[PDB]
């Protein structure tokens, strides 16, 4: 039919892409250790798509476009909502790192306490590194960056709302109790904005699978592997 | 019924955890070792030697440094029952033989 052809074509395209990606990885690990046949041009690991899929897409695209022709910027106001290649929450990360370091220095000199400047400079440095790695959102560093940023802002919110700030101690015991102040609110807005944008990367890191996930798996070697790991190598597989 | 079907297909690991792993292999052995070491006076025959025999008889395998049972026994039993005294023993009997008193 016309409905099974699409299924076949999507299967084929996905498989071609997976094989080209596995090739890029294995060729990189073989060329970074010498054994490559010397006709290998190391700029091929930059062709992302696949040669076959690319030729198909180019042909289809030119056919489509040939058969259809049988602040403020008043020429485009929606300049921010355009893909530039970096994470959306990128200038917020750097802005918050600058604000953190500035407040740390200011308050810790104007009082004499050594905690606020250490916290502020550590937070600023880690958020600056994160906002640097977030400048290429397609790659793997572009994902580990958002991870690090979320972790740091979450730790800030935690320390504020659960232990409070050393320089905010008073004589009473109900007034020197930890509440949520401005910097915690900003850090929370940051974590929420990170989660609502894209944090879906590196999704193959989780706890390993149980013998409860491989009970109805259609493969015997995988299930035997999982049982062996979790301590059940002797149980009989009457399966 | 449809909701229970969709929810059962996405939570096999958590289900097996809570039904087979949570108590029998995580909480019960911790509790048993801590309980035994809370009782059982501070000797070595009671704090280390008999625990090993009974653990191998029960679990059916000896606790080696590759297992968490060995390390739990070591820390709790040895370090907090016999070490604060065998330390004084060695500091008063074996260290004088060597150079520093």
């Amino acid at each position: 039919g016309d409905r099974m052809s699409r299924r076949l074509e999507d299967i084929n395209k996905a498989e071609r892409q997976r094989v080209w990606d596995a090739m890029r990885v294995a060729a990189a690990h073989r060329y970074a250790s010498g054994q490559m046949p010397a006709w290998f041009d190391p700029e091929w690991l930059q062709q992302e798509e696949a040669p076959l899929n690319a030729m198909d897409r180019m042909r289809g695209e030119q056919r489509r476009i040939e058969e259809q022709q049988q602040w403020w910027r008043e020429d485009d106001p929606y300049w921010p909502l355009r893909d530039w290649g970096d994470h959306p929450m990128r200038w917020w990360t750097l802005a918050f790192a600058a604000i953190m370091a500035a407040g740390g220095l200011a308050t810790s000199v104007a009082t004499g306490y050594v905690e606020p400047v250490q916290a502020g400079l550590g937070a600023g440095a880690l958020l600056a590194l994160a906002g640097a790695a977030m400048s290429d959102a397609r790659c793997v560093p572009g994902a580990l960056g958002v991870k690090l940023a979320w972790a740091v802002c979450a730790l800030i919110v935690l320390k504020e709302v659960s232990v409070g700030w050393q320089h905010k101690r008073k004589r009473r015991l109900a007034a020197s109790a930890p509440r949520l102040e401005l910097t915690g609110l900003a850090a929370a807005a940051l974590c929420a904005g990170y989660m609502l944008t894209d944090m879906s990367g590196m999704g193959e890191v989780a706890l390993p699978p149980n013998p409860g996930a491989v009970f109805k798996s259609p493969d015997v070697a995988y299930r035997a592997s999982v049982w062996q790991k979790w301590g059940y190598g002797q149980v009989q597989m009457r399966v | 019924g449809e909701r229970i079907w969709a929810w059962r297909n996405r939570s096999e690991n958590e289900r097996w955890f809570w039904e087979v792993f949570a108590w029998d292999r995580l909480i019960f052995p911790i509790l048993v070792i801590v309980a035994w070491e809370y009782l059982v006076p501070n000797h070595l025959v009671w704090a280390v030697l008999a625990p090993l025999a009974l653990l191998t008889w029960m679990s059916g395998r000896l606790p080696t440094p590759a297992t968490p049972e060995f390390w739990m026994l070591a820390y709790f039993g040895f370090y907090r029952k016999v070490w604060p005294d065998a330390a004084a023993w060695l500091q008063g009997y074996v260290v004088p033989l060597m150079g520093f008193a």
């Binding site: 390993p208 062996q228 790991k229 979790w230 301590g231 | 029998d24 292999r25 995580l26 019960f28 052995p29 911790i30 509790l31 048993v32 309980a35 035994w36 809370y38 009782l39 653990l55 008889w57 029960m58 679990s59 059916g60 395998r61 297992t67 968490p68 049972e69």
Partner: peptide, 24 residues
């Protein structure tokens, strides 16, 4: 090649339970 996890302690007997109330 196993994991770092406990074993069952009650596939053989029950006596270990006698330890929880007493300590309690």
């Amino acid at each position: 090649s196993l994991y770092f996890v406990f074993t069952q302690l009650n596939q053989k007997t029950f006596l270990s339970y006698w330890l929880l109330p007493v300590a309690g």
